[PDB]
C-alpha cells in the first residue's frame, strides 16, 4: 500500500514517473537532472515500472532532441516521460505543439526555473512553464514534497484517459531540493489506478505498419482551421478526468485536492490565489492570522490549464471583496501576469459581482517568500490596495514593490524546532545534517524538513543548511530566519557574516574553534556576537572540534563531531535516546570496514558529548567595545555592490544598484582575496632557475613573476628577496617568483612541476606563509609588468604579459583556467569571447565575481555568455558586426583618402587600410590615427575618429566545454567553422558534463564511468577532430599544456593568426575525472595523457596545403604503453575496476586498441600526398543572379512554397518528355 | 521623397529593412523567405543602407542560429534585423529573452503564421507572434501591404531610440504575399528620422575589448529578481516613443 | 577487413560537360565567366583530390574491430566513489540526495606533498 | 489600456474581441484577455465582452 | 513464428497467452527508417543526426540529396557545391560541398554508403 520516505520533490516525483513510464528519452539540467539520474541507477538497480519492466532510458544531445524523440516513442506505442526545465523546456516547445496536436498522453516533469534574460538563474519561478502555455499541454502544480508525488501520480493517470499531454509541475530548488518526511505509493497500487481500456486504445491507434496511417500532413487554408478545433471534446473532458484522478488517488492515500482548492475563513475578505509551493507558507500565515480574527484566505490553484472558470469560483467565499493574484513571472509589457489574467477574464465572463482585483509578483528566480512578505500582501488588500506590486525587492526605481516589516511573529506551528547550520564546502555539514534527518524521520512521529543553501563558489564555499522538526505539518517553504538551534562548523566566518541573525532568546549557539580559554574567546570573539549571545541569554557551547577529531584518530575530521552536538543540543530528542540512535547508526553507517573506523567514530560521539558543556561567559559581554573598521582601499563598486553581495547581504540591494542590461565590470575578483587554501607554495629563490613555469600552469593566476629594475626595489620589504634575472636580454633586472597566498586555492601544480630536483617551490601552512607574502604582494602588485623584454608568445615571455583572467571560482586545481589565463596574455586586449554555457560560464561570471579584467590601458577581453546551445553563432555575430563596422570605417577612410586630408593623415589612413587585419599595423596606424584626429568632430574625418575602438584588428574566440562541442552546440559549431569566417574557437574539453554533475558527453571515452555510463561507456569518444578536418579550409589542433607548453603558444598563434576558422581542443583536467593523487598532478596527468597516446597532439594548417605542403602535422609521439596506468590512475576508470573486473579489463583494453589505431592514422595522415591545393579565394565582384535565369525547362515549382514576386512566366513543366523527345516527336507527327 | 510602386508585403518591408540594418543573419521560412532573398539581390547590386554601405548578410543553419548570431551582432554594436515566422520564430524564442534582457534595438520582421500541431500549415494567423508574446519584445502589427511599409519604419527607428528590441509583424500570404500599389519613402528620408545620439550611445555601450564589460553573468536568489525588474523604465517609455516616431 | 569499398571509377574527365549541363553551373558562366570558370575547375580538383583520398582509404589496413552490443550487467556504480578527492564541487548545480560527505577537496596539495609536509613537521 | 480607452467610444455596450490564434484549455485568447484586463482595472463602466476565433490557417475572414 | 503465433491464439483474451495475442503487431521485425533531404542532414538536423547515428541503435537514414533547400526556393545549404548558382549562393558557392559521408564514417561503427540510381541500380 504505502509506506513513510523522507527525500526531495524532485525524488517523489522520479519515484511516480518511473512507474508509470516504459520510455523516457533526457537531457541534464539543473534543477530537475537528478530526475533522471535517479531514473538511470533504479533501472540498473533492477526496478520494475508497473508492466513489470526496467525503464528504457536514453540521453539526447538535446532538450530539444529529447522532445522529438519522445514525441516518436509516443507515436509509437509507448507511455512516455521528460524531466526539463528553463532553457531546456524552451527548446521542447516545438515538438509540445505536435505532443498535443496528435493527442498523446505523455507527461513531462518540470521544475520550474527562472530564464535567461538580463542573467542566467538555475533558481525557481514560473517563466519557464508559462512560456509553454499556449502548447495546449494540460498543466498541473504541485506545492509540496508530497503533492509533487500526488499530482506526478493524477498527470500520468489522467493523460493516459485524456489523450491530453501533461506537464506536472512544482518549484525549483524551493520543492524540487526540499527535503521532506513524506508517504509514497506501492506500484502495485498505482498500476491498479490504470484506466486499461483507455491504455489498449493508446495502443491501437499507435503508428504500426500492420494497420498504418499517415500523421503530420501539410493541410491548406480549406481544412486547417476545421482540423485545429477537432481535439475540443478532448480539451472539455480533462477537467473532469483530473478531478476524479485526484478523488481515486485519495481513495488510497487520504489525501484530497480539487482544480482549485481553498483554505482560510470561510467568510473571508481578502483572498489570495496563488500556485505553487508559496501556497504552504500563505496557509501557514493564515492559521495564524485567522485565529486572531483576520477574515483572509488562499485559492491554491492545481489545475492551471485547462483553466475553469467553474471549479476556480466553487473555491471563492461570495465574501471576498478584495482579491491579489500573486503570479511568480515577468512578462515585460504585458497589461499583467499569466494567472491574473485568467483570473480576469473569470470575472468578466461571470458578470456578476465584482471584487477588486490586485496583481502582484513574488519569488523570481528562488527569490525568498516569507511569512512577512505574505503578511505585506494581506495588509496591502485592507490598505493602499497597490496594483501590479512586486514583494521581496525594494523597487526605489518605479516604486512598485510592498514595504515589508520582517519583525512580523514567527508562524511555524507549535512544537516546531528550526536549526541554521554555516558549513564550509567538504566538511561533511551538509551529509551530516541528511543523516540526521533520516534517522529523525525515520525513529519517530516527527514531520522533518532540510533544505541547503549553497555557494557560487566550487571550492571553499560557504553552506547554509536549514533544518526544521515538529510534531505538526511543516508548510514553512521559505528559510529559517529565528533558529533555535545555530552552528557555526567554521571558526573564520564568526567575524565575516552575521551567523546570530534572528536567533531567539535563549537559544543554543554551538561554535567550532580552538578558542577554549576566556582569554582566548574575548580575543578572537567580535563584541557584536558576544553582546548578543549576552543580551539574548544564550546557551553558548564552544568545541575544539578538530582537535577532538584528531585525538580519536579521525584525521582531524569534524563532521562526526558536530553531529553529536546537533543531536545533544538540538532538543529535538531525549538525549538518551539521541545518542542511541546516533551511535546505532554510526554501526548502519561506516562498519564496512574494520571496527576502528566504528571505534573512533563511536569515540568521537562519547568524546564530544562530555566536552559540550556550556561555556560560560561574563556579563560584561553586555556591552563589549565595538571595533574599529580595518578594511583596506578598495572599488566603489565593490564596497557598495560586491561586497555586500559576498556577506550575503545581495537581498538588501535595491533595483537601483544594478545595470538595466544585466552587465557587471570587469575584475571585481581582484579584492575577493578568500584566502581559502589549507597549504600555499612557498618560493626558494636558491633553487630556482627562473623559468616562469610555475605562473604559466597556476589555474587561478595565484603567482606573480617580477621583474624590475635596482630603482623599482628601493621601498622593498626587506623579505622581498630577488635573484640576479638570467638570460641576455635580462641582463641587470632582479627576478622574483612572488606568491598571492591569499588567491591561491593551493591545488600543487606549481610545486609539483617545478623543474629542479630540489624544488624552488614547497608547500607549507597558509598561515606560515601570510604575514609575509601579503604585503610582499602588494608592493610587487605595484611593479610594472615589463612586457616589452621578452617575445609575447614565448613560455617565459607569456608570464612577463598582464593575465586578463584571475582568482576566479573554479575548483582548486581546474584543468581549465590555465589555459584560458594564458590565452588572454597573448591576445587579451583585443578579444571578444562568445563564452558557452558551462563550468567557464560559471567561473568566468557568476555575479558577483568577475575574474576577467582589463590591462593598465584599460582594455580587456569583451565577455559574454548568450545560451549553453549558441556559443558559436553568437560569436559568429560578433564576427558579423565587426566585419560590417570595419568594412564601414575602411569605407570612409578610402573617401578621406580622395579628400583634401593632411598629408599625414593619409598616410596613416593609407597604412591603416593595408594592414587592416593585422593586429601589429592596424593597431600601429591606427595609433596614429588616434592623435592625429583627436578633438576632430566634423565631416569625414570626424567619423573616423569616432570609430577608434575599430581600428586594431580584434579576435574573436569562442569558449566552450566538451558537451557544447561535440553535443548541443555541435550542429552550430559545424556551421560556423564551415563559414569560413575568422574566428577561433577553444574547446575546454572535460570528457563528460562537469558543471551539471558529470554526466556523460560524445567526448566521453569508452569505459569511462560517468553519469549514464555507469557501468563504463560503451562507445568510443566521438572524433571531433577529424571530422572538422574534412572541410580541408578550417585549421584544427589538438593541445596539452602539461606536455608541451610550447606546442600549446605555437597552436594558439598559428590558430589566431589563421585568416579563416579555427578550432583548438585542449585536454582539461577535472575534478569529476577523479584525480588519484589531487589535482596538483593535473600537469602531470596532461603530460601522460599525450605519451601515453591517449591523446596525440597535432595541428592541420589549410596554409601549407596552399603552398604544396601536407597541412596537417603530428606533434607527439607514438603510444609508449603507458596508457594502463594513466586509466587506473583515475577513478573514473579505476571504480569500474573495483565493481566490475571483467568488464572494465576488456573497456581499458578496447581503449588501448583504440588510440594505436588511431596513432595509426594520423601518421598515415602525416605522410599522405593527398590534399587540395587550389586557389586561396579571391573574386566575389558585384552582381548576382537568380539560379532560374535562363533555364530550358521550369525551375520552380506550382506550389505556394516557392511563389515569389517575379515567379509566374511560362515555361517547359516537363509534362512533355526531354528536348529530344519531343523534337523526335514533332519529326514524327510531321503533318 | 516619396515614390510610388506596386509590390507585396514581404518587399515593402524588406525595403525598410534593409535600409535601417547593418547586419541580418537569416534562416528561410515560407512565407518570409521572399524578404531574405530580396535582401541578398539589393546587397549584390550594391544597393546602400542609411549608412552608404551594402548589407551584411549571412545564412545559418537554423533560426536558432540566426537568433544567435544576431544576438552576437546586436551585443558587438551593430544595428542587426531578420526575417522569420511559425516554427522558425519558437526556435528564436530563447534568444529573444537574451536581446531584450540585455535591451538591444534588434528587429525582427514576422510573417505571421500557424504553427504545426494536428498537422503543419504555411498559411497566416497569429500562433506564432501570440507564442513569443511574453520575450520582451515590443509587437507592433501591420494590417496591409502600405502598413506594412509604415509600421515596419516605425519598429525600426523605435527599436533605436528606446533599446528595446521590436517584433513587426503582419499576416503571413493574406499581407506578405497581396501586391498593393503604395508609396514608400527614400532611403534619406528614412535616415533623417534616425536618433543619432541613441544611435551613436548604442555602440558606446556595446562589446569591445577597448572597453570590456561582462554581461550573461549567473546570478543568485539574491539579487536576480532586482536585476529583472531594472529595466522597467525603457518598456514604461516604448508606447511614448511608438507614438512620436508615428507622427 | 576493411570496412570502406570504393563501388565506382576514377573521375573521367566529363565533369565540365556534367556541370555546364545544369543552369545551376551554366547561369554563372553567362553573368560570370571569369569567375565561373575558375569555379568549375576548383571543383573538377576537389573531386580528383577526394576521389584519391577515397583510393586511400580502400587500400589502407588500418581500422579498429566491430561489435554491435554486449555486455552492460546489471548494475552500475557512481564515477565518486572510492575516490581519494572529492569529485563534486560545492555548487547547487551538482548537489544530489546523496551528496554533502566529507573529502579532501585539494586546497592542501597533491598526496605526496601532504605526506611530505607532514613529514616535515611531524613534532 | 489608456490608449486602447482612448479609441473606444463611450456609447459602446457590446464589444468583440477576434483573436487569430487557438490557446488550447486557456479561459480565452490572448487578446481578449488583455482586454478584460483593461476593464477589470478602469473599474468602470462593464460593456458585455465577447472572444471569437478566425481566419486560422489563411481561413478567409470575409 | 509470428504468423503461427497469430494462428496459435486465435481468440486468446485471458491471461499470459492473452497478453502475448493483443501484441501481434509486434510480432514482426519493424525498420525504422529516418528520410530527409540534404537541407535537413547537413544542416538543421545535423546535430541530431549526428547524436542518433553516434548511438549505435538499429535506425536507417536516407538522405535525398538535392544539393539545395529545394520545396522552399533553391536556398544554398552545407550540401551545395563549389560554384553552384542558388540562393544566398547567388555569385557561386565560395565554400565546399560539406562531407558529411567522411565525417560519420569516422565512428566506424556506422554503416555508411552513397547511391545514384542512374549509375547502377544494383549497387
Ligand atoms: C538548452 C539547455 N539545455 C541544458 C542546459 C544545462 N547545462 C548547462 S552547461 C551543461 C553541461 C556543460 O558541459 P560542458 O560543455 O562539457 O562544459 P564543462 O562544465 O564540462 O566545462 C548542461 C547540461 C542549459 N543551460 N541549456
Ligand atoms: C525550424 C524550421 N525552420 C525552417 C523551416 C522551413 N523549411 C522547411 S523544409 C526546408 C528545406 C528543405 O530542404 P531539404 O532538407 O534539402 O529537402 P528538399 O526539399 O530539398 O528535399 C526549409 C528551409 C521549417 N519548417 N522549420
Ligand atoms: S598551489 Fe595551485 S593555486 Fe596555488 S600558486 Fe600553486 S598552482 Fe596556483
Ligand atoms: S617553476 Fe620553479 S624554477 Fe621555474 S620559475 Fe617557478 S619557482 Fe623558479
Ligand atoms: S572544469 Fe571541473 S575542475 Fe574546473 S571548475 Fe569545472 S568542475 Fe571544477
Ligand atoms: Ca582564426
Ligand atoms: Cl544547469
Ligand atoms: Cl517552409
Ligand atoms: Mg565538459
Ligand atoms: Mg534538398
Redesign the interface.
Known sequence: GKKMMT??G??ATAHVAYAMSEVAAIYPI??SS?MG??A??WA???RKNIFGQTLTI?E???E??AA?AVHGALAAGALTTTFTAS?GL??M??NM??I???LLPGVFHVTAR??????????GDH?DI??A??T?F?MLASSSVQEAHDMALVAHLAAIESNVPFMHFFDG?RTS?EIQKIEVLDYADMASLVNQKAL?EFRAKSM????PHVR??????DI??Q?????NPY?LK?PGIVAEYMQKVASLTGRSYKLFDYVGAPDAERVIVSMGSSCETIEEVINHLAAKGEKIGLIKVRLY???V?EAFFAALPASAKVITVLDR????????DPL???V??????R?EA?P??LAGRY??????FSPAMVKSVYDNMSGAKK?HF?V????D??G?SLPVDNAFADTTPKGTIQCQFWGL??????????QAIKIIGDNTDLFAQGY??????????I?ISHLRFGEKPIQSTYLVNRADYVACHNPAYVGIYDILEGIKDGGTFVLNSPWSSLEDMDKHLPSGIKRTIANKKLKFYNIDAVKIATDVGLGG?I?MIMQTAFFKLAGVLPFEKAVDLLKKSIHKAYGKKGEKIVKMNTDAVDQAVTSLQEFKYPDSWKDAPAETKAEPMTNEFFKNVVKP?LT????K???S??????????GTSQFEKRG????VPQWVPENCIQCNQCAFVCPHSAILPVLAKEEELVGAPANFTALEAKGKELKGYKFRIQINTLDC????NC??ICPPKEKALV???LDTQRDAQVPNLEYAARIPVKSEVLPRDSLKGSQFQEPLMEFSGA???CGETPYVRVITQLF?????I??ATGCS??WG????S?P?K?NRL??????????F?????????????????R??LA?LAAKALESDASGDVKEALQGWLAGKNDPIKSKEYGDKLKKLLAGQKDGLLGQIA?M??LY?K?SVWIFGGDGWAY??????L??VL???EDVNVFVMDTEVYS????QSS?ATPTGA???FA??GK???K??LA??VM????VYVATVSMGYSKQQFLKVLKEAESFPGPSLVIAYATC??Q????????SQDVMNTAVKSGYWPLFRYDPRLAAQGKNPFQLDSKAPDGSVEEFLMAQ??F???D???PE?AK?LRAQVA??LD?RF??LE?MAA?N???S??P????????????????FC??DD???????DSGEACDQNRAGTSEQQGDLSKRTKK
Not at 553535443?967 to 552550430?972: L, Q
Open positions: 527525500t526531495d524532485n525524488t539543473t534543477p537528478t539520474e535517479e538511470d541507477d540498473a538497480q533492477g536514453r539526447m544531445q538535446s530539444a532532441g522529438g532553457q524552451l527548446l516547445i516545438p505543439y505536435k498535443s496536436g496528435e527562472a530564464i535567461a534574460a538580463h542573467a542566467l538563474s538555475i533558481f517563466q508559462y512560456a502555455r499556449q495546449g494540460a530548488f531540493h489498449a504500426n505498419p500492420e494497420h503530420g500532413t501539410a493541410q491548406n487554408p486547417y482551421f482540423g485545429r478545433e477537432a481535439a480539451y480533462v490549464r485547462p483553466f472558470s513571472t515577468k512578462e515585460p509589457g504585458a497589461p499583467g491574473y489574467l485568467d480576469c477574464s473569470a470575472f468578466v465572463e458578470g465584482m477588486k482585483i519569488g523570481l528566480g528562488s527569490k525568498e496594483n512586486t521581496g525587492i525594494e523597487d526605481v518605479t512598485t564546502g567538504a566538511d561533511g555539514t551538509v551529509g551530516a545534517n541528511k541547503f543553501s549553497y555557494d557560487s563558489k566550487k571550492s571553499g564555499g553552506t575530521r563532521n553581495i550575503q547581504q545581495g537581498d540591494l535595491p533595483v544598484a544594478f545595470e538595466a542590461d544585466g552587465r557587471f565590470p570587469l581559502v587554501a589549507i597549504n586555492m593551493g591545488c600543487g610545486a609539483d608547500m607549507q601552512p575548483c582548486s586545481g587579451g586586449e583585443r578579444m571578444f562568445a563564452n560560464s560559471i561570471a557568476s555575479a558577483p568577475m576577467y582589463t584599460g582594455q580587456g577581453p569583451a565577455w559574454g555568455n548568450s545560451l546551445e549558441d556559443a558559436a553563432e553568437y560569436g559568429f555575430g560578433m564576427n558579423m558586426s565587426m566585419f560590417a563596422r568594412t564601414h569605407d569616432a577608434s575602438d586594431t580584434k553535443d548541443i552546440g555541435y550542429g552550430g559545424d556551421h564551415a563559414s569560413g558543471n551539471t554533475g558529470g560524445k564511468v560517468a553519469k555507469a557501468a560503451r562507445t568510443g566521438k572524433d577529424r571530422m574534412t572541410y580541408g579550409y575534478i569529476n577523479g584525480l588519484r593523487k589531487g589535482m596538483g598532478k577513478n573514473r579505476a571504480v569500474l573495483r565493481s566490475f568488464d576488456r586498441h583504440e589505431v595509426k592514422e598515415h599522405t593527398i590534399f587540395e587550389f586557389a579565394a579571391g573574386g566575389k565582384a558585384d552582381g548576382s543572379v537568380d539560379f532560374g535565369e535562363g533555364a530550358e525551375t520552380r506550389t505556394p512554397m516557392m511563389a515569389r514576386p
